[PDB]
Point group: C5
Chain length 206, copies 5
């Protein structure tokens, strides 16, 4: 359990081999979740990349936040993908919150504290608890099979995960910096393992 | 009578079958009215949709607030339509107030607290009180005959209706959040019936 | 004498017949004047229109504030016209103050409290006091001969006129809402006559 | 000595004949100077114009601040010209400060309180003290030979001149309205002579 | 040791010959560094230029901050170049901070207090301590071989250098004006030598 407060992981160059594995003490399969994080990259103009890769022995894209070139954010649960278009991307750190509820199939996507419209994905599905959670690479197999053309080059930090859906007020206080306690992944008590060319530096965002 | 305060209806995917019916205890035929609501959708770029459908046994478009593609807001009273052009639409929740007065034929259309110019529609007409009021679908018959290419995908909430014309000061306090009491539909004492894939969630707008 | 405070005239649809006649207790011919008013229309994109028409038995355009399509504001004294170009018009209520001095020929044109450059018009001329002052239509004869292609569709209010030139400080307090007393036309003590489809409603601007 | 505080010269229409002559009690030839003024014109879009013309019996363009069409500000000392490009001009009063030092050849050009980059002009030259200083026309001879295609149509005021180079802090306080005392031309104690169609009016700028 | 506080070097015209040499009392070879400075030029539109040239007997571009035309900032360590694109450059003084760490190869580039994304350059390299540090010209040999098409025309000042990597908080206080003490080059205790047409003037930036 490391307190990563005020720090970020840095992936300085394109690679096939650099990544961070986040460990979740998870037991129950997930019937809802929220994932929040900050990242900062210049890749958006030139190619696609993985922001947050959550794989199961059965499904490599159990939860996947991804940027696909010339389109926008792609959100995947249990292999099914929906898009959140983004025209006119700007060069700055980005904060995202994303949530999904099995009961309703409703997914929420928040960019820099502002909600995108609500969409539907995998109603009644159940997300596996035996997971390989990876920053910096996109998983095609449980814990590996990375593609370099999908790696994240830049910084990522403030990664947090809950096993339920955050309310708009909660998401807001998270973005504005208020106090909170995630029950799946906690940036302030993070169990992680590093592989390859990854560094821990002070965060570039406020 | 449910208190819908701080909540919204969510229509997560395009459908033919999902809608909400709002019940008005109305008696007198309407010689004036105001309708206010918040909605949030990404459909504006790709197709048209119904925001608020108010039908009579005699007229399916007795009161109709509609977004027509590549044009802007369409407002219909007793079957007659006028347009309120909107170039450069932005992706965010929108709040609208719209009013009509039989005596003068004057209609007002307010977007996010700002008035559009005043226009003329159906001077001397009378709006029926035996109505089917529907969110999420556009009515082609009293209480049905929906077209999926006109459904609302996204959120809608804070729906309120008065049987008179709101003054600019009143509309302003409504937009800014001050206190008010509608006498036809009241979001804080709403009698409604749900059909299909419709959910009640915390509102995405302030 | 009606107190029109906080109210505006509304001309809801294009017409040939709808207008307001303002009555001035004027005696001395004018050797200087200032005219201020608010108006709100969507016509700027599609055609020209008259904002303030002041006619004499001898001259239909004794004082004329007009919007000419794809050009901007046209200001006419005693039949002579100058232009105040406006590129990139915005859709909102507009406040204008306009002044002219015989001694110097200097005209001023203020839009939303900001001065346009000073220009020259009719040095030494004298404006008649026996006037037909009309809102909503453009006069081609003393008190009539309207063209519908020049009518104002929308709102106009806060019309005030002085028989001298307002200083920049005075014009500023007028725009910001401070106190003042006009000595030719006074919105707070207005003698007027309505003809046709014209209504009195609460103003849409602050 | 007139106190021109809070007033400006107005040149209402294009002319060949209208100008103001500023009188400087100057004795020493100038080895440095600063000139500050406000002006307001709409000519920038259509043609060039003279802002401040300072002529010697030997040199018609001893000091010349000029706007040249589709380029920007032109600054001339002793007949030698440098340019300060201006794309995207806006329609509003402009305040400029311009300075030159013989010792270094450095010229500064300040627009609305903001410094342009430093440039070089006439190192080691000496500016004559027997000068004809003219507002509203561009001099081609000592005290005359005006070209109408170079006249200033609009307002000009707050003209002040020093015989040394103003520091950035000094220029700032001049722009922001603080107290100062110029030692060549003083707007608050201005000795001037008017010719033709020129008027004195309250300034349009703050 | 001169205190250059509140002063800048001015290079008024394009030249082959004008420059400043900064002297560093450096002993250890550098395994990390940070360089900060302000500069102000109008060259960005027309050609490239050197901002900060640091040369070794072995490498002319040991550390080079450079603006390359129609691309943006170029940062070079030990001959290897990376780019920091800049579209839509603005005409104003610019402040930059740039850093490099041998251990990780991470470079940071900060413009006007805002971080660009982190990149990789020369991991494990070592920067030489026997250096010729030059402002105003780009070095192609140790202490000379300048190209005029790469000279800086304008102002440069507040040059400071550390032998370690500044944290984001430190960089912020440097940009906002707080206190600091650099241990390689110190603007407040600067040992320098001037050659050619270079002047010392009060800085144009706050
Ligand atoms: Ca995959
Ligand atoms: Ca893959
Ligand atoms: Ca219908
Ligand atoms: Ca239909
Ligand atoms: Ca006429
Ligand atoms: Ca006419
Ligand atoms: Ca000349
Ligand atoms: Ca000339
Ligand atoms: Ca070189
Ligand atoms: Ca070179």
């Amino acid at each position: 359990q490391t307190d990563m407060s005020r720090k970020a992981f840095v992936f300085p160059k394109e690679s096939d081999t650099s990544y961070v594995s986040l460990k979740a003490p998870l037991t129950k399969p997930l019937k809802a979740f929220t994932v929040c994080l900050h990242f900062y990259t210049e890749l958006s103009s030139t190619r696609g990349y993985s922001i947050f890769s959550y794989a199961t022995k059965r499904q490599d894209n159990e939860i996947l936040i991804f940027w696909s070139k010339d389109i926008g954010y792609s959100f995947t649960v249990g292999g099914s993908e929906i898009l959140f278009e983004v025209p006119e991307v700007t060069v700055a750190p980005v904060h995202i919150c994303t949530s999904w509820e099995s009961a309703s199939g409703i997914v929420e996507f928040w960019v820099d504290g502002k909600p995108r419209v609500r969409k539907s994905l995998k109603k009644g599905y159940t997300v596996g608890a035996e997971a390989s959670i990876i920053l910096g690479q996109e998983q095609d197999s449980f814990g590996g099979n990375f593609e370099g053309s999908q790696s994240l080059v830049g910084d990522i930090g403030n990664v947090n995960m809950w096993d339920f859906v955050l309310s708009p007020d909660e998401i807001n206080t998270i973005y504005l910096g208020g106090p909170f306690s995630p029950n799946v992944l906690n940036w302030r008590a993070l169990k992680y393992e590093v592989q390859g060319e990854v560094f821990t530096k002070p965060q570039l965002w406020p």
